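Progress note, project year one: complex with manganese (II) ion.
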Amino acid sequence: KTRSSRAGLQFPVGRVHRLLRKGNYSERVGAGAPVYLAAVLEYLTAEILELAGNAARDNKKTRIIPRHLQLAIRNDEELNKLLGRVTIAQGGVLPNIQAVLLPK
Amino acid sequence: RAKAKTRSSRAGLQFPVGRVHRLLRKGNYSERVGAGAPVYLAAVLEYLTAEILELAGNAARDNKKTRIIPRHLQLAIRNDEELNKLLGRVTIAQGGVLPNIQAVLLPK
Amino acid sequence: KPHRYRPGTVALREIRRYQKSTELLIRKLPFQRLVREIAQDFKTDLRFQSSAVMALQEACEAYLVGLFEDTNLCAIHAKRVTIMPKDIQLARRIRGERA
Amino acid sequence: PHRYRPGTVALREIRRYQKSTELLIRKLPFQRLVREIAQDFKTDLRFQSSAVMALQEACEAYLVGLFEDTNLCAIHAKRVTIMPKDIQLARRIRGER
Amino acid sequence: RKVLRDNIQGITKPAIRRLARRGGVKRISGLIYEETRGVLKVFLENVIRDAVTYTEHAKRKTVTAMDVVYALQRQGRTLYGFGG
Amino acid sequence: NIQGITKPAIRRLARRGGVKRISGLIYEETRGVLKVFLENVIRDAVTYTEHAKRKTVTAMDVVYALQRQGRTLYGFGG
Amino acid sequence: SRKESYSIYVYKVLKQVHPDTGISSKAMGIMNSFVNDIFERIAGEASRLAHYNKRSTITSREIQTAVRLLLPGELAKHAVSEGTKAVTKYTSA
Amino acid sequence: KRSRKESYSIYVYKVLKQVHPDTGISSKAMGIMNSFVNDIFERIAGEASRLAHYNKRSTITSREIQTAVRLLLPGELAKHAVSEGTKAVTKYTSA
DNA sequence: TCAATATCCACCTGCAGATTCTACCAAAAGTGTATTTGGAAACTGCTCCATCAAAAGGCATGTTCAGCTGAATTCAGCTGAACATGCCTTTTGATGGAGCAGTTTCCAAATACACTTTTGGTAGAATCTGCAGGTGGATATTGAT
DNA sequence: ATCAATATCCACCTGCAGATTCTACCAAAAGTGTATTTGGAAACTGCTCCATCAAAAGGCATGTTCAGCTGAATTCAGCTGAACATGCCTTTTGATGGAGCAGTTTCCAAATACACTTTTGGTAGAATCTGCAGGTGGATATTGA
Ligand SMILES: [Cl-]
Ligand SMILES: [Cl-]
Ligand SMILES: [Cl-]
Ligand SMILES: [Cl-]
Ligand SMILES: [Mn+2]
Ligand SMILES: [Mn+2]
Ligand SMILES: [Mn+2]
Ligand SMILES: [Mn+2]
Ligand SMILES: [Mn+2]
Ligand SMILES: [Mn+2]
Ligand SMILES: [Mn+2]
Ligand SMILES: [Mn+2]
Ligand SMILES: [Mn+2]
Ligand SMILES: [Mn+2]
Ligand SMILES: [Mn+2]
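Model obtained:
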């Protein structure tokens, strides 16, 4: 009997509500906002984790690590933009070498 | 009863302390707002506008005008290193740009 | 004679000139028309406050004028004095605009 | 003996380092550098183990990023060797300088 | 009303040249003008989009200057002078 | 101390950066930038530290500083 | 004492997309930093949206617009989808 | 009946006379000056808001406004801002 | 093209630093009730946005025409890479110890409320004025010879 | 080094859009008495930073040798700027109609407050694994001849 289960979400609606409420954002908080926001957070999370899981697989690994999260993001146009000014610790960089720098 | 006396005067300021206090509460910054807060803020605000009007007013003097306009505001901000940094991502409508021509571009 | 300035003399003249002014350089109507075109391709039956169209032009010209500044640096850095698309792209790339 | 042409190992080093993610600045030196600068702002400070690592992470990322835009500039100048002028140009278009 | 098309060409070669001048540009390659139009198109599109988003959330049919200001703000392109 | 950041490390950084050839002047130029970066970040972190009346710079202090510098970093509490 | 984070929720969600995959400690960190960030961005914009419109309360209306404004085209659609969906469902039961 | 909207014009003008008793300011320039004040107000109040949150403090005191100012303004500008700030406060409090 | 010298890439292997998994206790989160009140209708007042008409001349178009800039080529010295050497600083680990980031109370000073009067501000009006636009004239800058 | 051709820079002028000063309400500061916290002020722990020590292990500092990269020079085809004729549209003014912001009231659906009642999430130990880090062995990729 929790809003998250009621919203069919795996993310804490109650917590999101408590945060929106405590974060000095507005005087009053709608009943649905925590749900909506919680949905959005969860969705974006799934998106990262999937691509990240695929990245882990391609490396023949079962456990996701920073590298995989960096490879997932910098490789996806949209996620890359949404996080263009964020740096993922321990993620390194996409392999890339300017053509003019190659031999022959 | 006691005669009304403004907080700005108590603080010795031009800017409206009471108005600033209102803005802070209504602004959703924190649950409660101390008393020195609007004073210190109105103070800083008044000092910053004073710093730029001085510089702007000079810019006006130099172009022989007596009424400050945006260009005068731009010249003041873009020539003073600090204000420039403080407003390095602010764009002033009708301010133009500082006259500057790269050397390589000049007649040899 | 007749008389005619050597290529570049007028350019520098034009630079000195336009850097002294603060007026807008894109014509008002052609630009308003361009806003309305773009806007309605996002949402129809729209209306604009006189000032909104002006706030947009002030912004666009301010943006372009600054991009050309950076572009001009890239050209020069390339031992050139003529800006080329290459430069506008290097600029925007480093700016992190369309990296 | 057997030598590799100039740039052959360089490319090799590139491919290797773009592959890994380990920090590339030696820890202690850095530790020391951070603490020194910090001392000029507040004395007898203590640094949380993690706080230092965060800085090195942030810092090494920043540089690697800057070396990227720098290389782009050097190339734009028909070069293959980055020079101080390239860093300067990059940082300027970035709005840091 | 009337149909709007190809208005990007309203940004004449003369005007783009004037702009480059203020930017302190002496010589301009023939291919700049169209690149410029490209860049401007994108810039405007992004700003008008956010602007209109603000307008719709306000349940209005008129884009106000503030909408454009908040739009520019988001793009990290803060503009002074139209505070309303 | 700044001299502690050696050529070889700077080489490696440039390498991950995709740089193939390095002018001899880069190393010293690089330390200059590297120094300004820490000065700016650290200076802010410490400011966050003192406002907390603490004597220990915390990772969160660095994180918040890194955010103010537009260098948002994931992995240390945010 | 207590120090809450999204670790659980991230993990639960992890298991749905990859029931077979695991996640390193540092990786979880990147994920928390991620959620807090986005959480802050959306809540932030939503806060402003209500002020510009002189409203005392932040509703799904604001959060949705906030998403349109912050997330990239395709990402925004799905986000908007998932969002309205959770509310609808939540409202029904 | 058009509702009334506030601004800082009155105060900007006062301060202007103090620095250049002889100088005026166009309405467009005051337009900019207003944007400036609102801008910095928001920047400061914001970092202050944030700073209090971090320190589990529910109230924004002048000590917040001050750290905020040190974080947002550069060198000298911060030095003088802080004095003026402090000075004003103590005066205000000191009767 | 060969022949040799490092590099790289696989596969399989085994310890071990982290992960999982296992069990519990208090802060949160979910319920019920009783109020409160934000802001969605239903209206209307009335800015100000879209359009129109018309005349004028500032500018946008398109051509010519050739100065001189960008773009190949060539070439040499000299900077920066590849390397074998060899010594010094950094990396790794307990060890304790002292500093200090957190909590547990206290409560006195400071802030929030409620609501009751006072005025500083804002919106027009009526009153002024810096200066945009024009001009003629003393310079100043360019470019040919 | 003129010196003829043009573009500039300046001071003098003066009616008029705009900037100021003048006035009359009225939102919203300021007051004053209460009720409610906030968070600074000693004491008192754990727990993580700091120091110290102590090796080896790499990793960095040096000096050689020369490959090949970066400029400096030349050269020239033709792109892009300057000047000019033509006449298209944008710019200016002034006048409306009416789409729609906006100010008012009305007041339920929905959010806040509260007192309880039940979870669920964060810890602090116990129970496995995913991989790093090696070890061959086998083609590769580079290079010199
Ligand atoms: Cl809601
Ligand atoms: Cl090009
Ligand atoms: Cl250089
Ligand atoms: Cl205070
Ligand atoms: Mn003065
Ligand atoms: Mn109400
Ligand atoms: Mn024509
Ligand atoms: Mn020719
Ligand atoms: Mn040339
Ligand atoms: Mn040679
Ligand atoms: Mn009065
Ligand atoms: Mn004039
Ligand atoms: Mn109507
Ligand atoms: Mn549980
Ligand atoms: Mn391995």
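Residues 1, 12-15, 27, 62 of chain E lie near DNA strand I (CB under 10 Å from a C1').
The radius of gyration of chain E is 16 Å.
No further modelling is planned for this target in the current period.
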